[PDB]
Chain A
Amino acid sequence: FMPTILSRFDMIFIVKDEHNEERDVMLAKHVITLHVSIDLAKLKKFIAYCRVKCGPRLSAEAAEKLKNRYIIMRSGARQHERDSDRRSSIPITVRQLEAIVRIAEALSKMKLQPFATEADVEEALRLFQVSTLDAAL
């Protein structure tokens, strides 16, 4: 997998398999949940109206939040790649920044909130700190 087809996305989750015996109790539960054989039927008809009625953009403060988050995300990748340069890595790019913005939009669309704020930018940034460190590992 090239560092470029990989970079065509924005969020990487290395899914993990748990084989714990309490996890195996969860599995024993799920066994009969199939052996026997907020709802989607309204979730879909909710989305159908949410997507088509909200026009969210960013507020002035989210801008200076993201600028100072992204600049300091860049500012260390230099000393990261200038020494180790292990023939492959993943640095930040403006496409990923635009991905962050369009994620915050979708968060603040859950609430029909026509103006997003710091209410979700940091948690989205931490979600991304997970999603980029996954591909880092």
Chain B
Amino acid sequence: EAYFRVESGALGPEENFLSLDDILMSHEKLPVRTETAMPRLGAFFNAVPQGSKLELPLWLAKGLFDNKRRILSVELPKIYQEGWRTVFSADPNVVDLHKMGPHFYGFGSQLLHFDSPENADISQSLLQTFIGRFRRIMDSSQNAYNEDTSALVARLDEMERGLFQTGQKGLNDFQCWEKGQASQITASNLVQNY
């Protein structure tokens, strides 16, 4: 109630520095093709050729990128390719955005700092998927009371679980006021140890 973690800026211009969600977000891998040799460090993948397909975290490919593609170029995973961008248009209420994740909107908004050609078509997928999956999170979260919700929440990602936990915290708080139950003073964080 007073532990206010630093929130995630993974949807705006640039992720926050201290947010433990973005730190684990950017760690996810991404495919690149190198433009030069990689001397003195070919141990991991001593030198590495130019024109080689490698898998690197996102944070690494932040500074190793330039406009001229001096060191390496990037190509998007298939989840954001043209293939799946039609699937997410058929009916977005069917996809398991936890397997295709578990950071869909967080990752996809950082792949816009690579000035690829099809950006005007990724920032339209996300917008049209989130709008598609809305009337199923506005209604399965404000209307699921004293139920086992661990199956209404099995196909969501970190940007959506944060909302499914705000619908419930406002349902279970009006239903606790209606029953004269939110008058008793209780232990706040000690019942967490118990």
Per the CB under 8 Å rule, do A and B touch in the complex? no
Interfacial residues, chain A to chain B (CB-CB below 8 A) = none
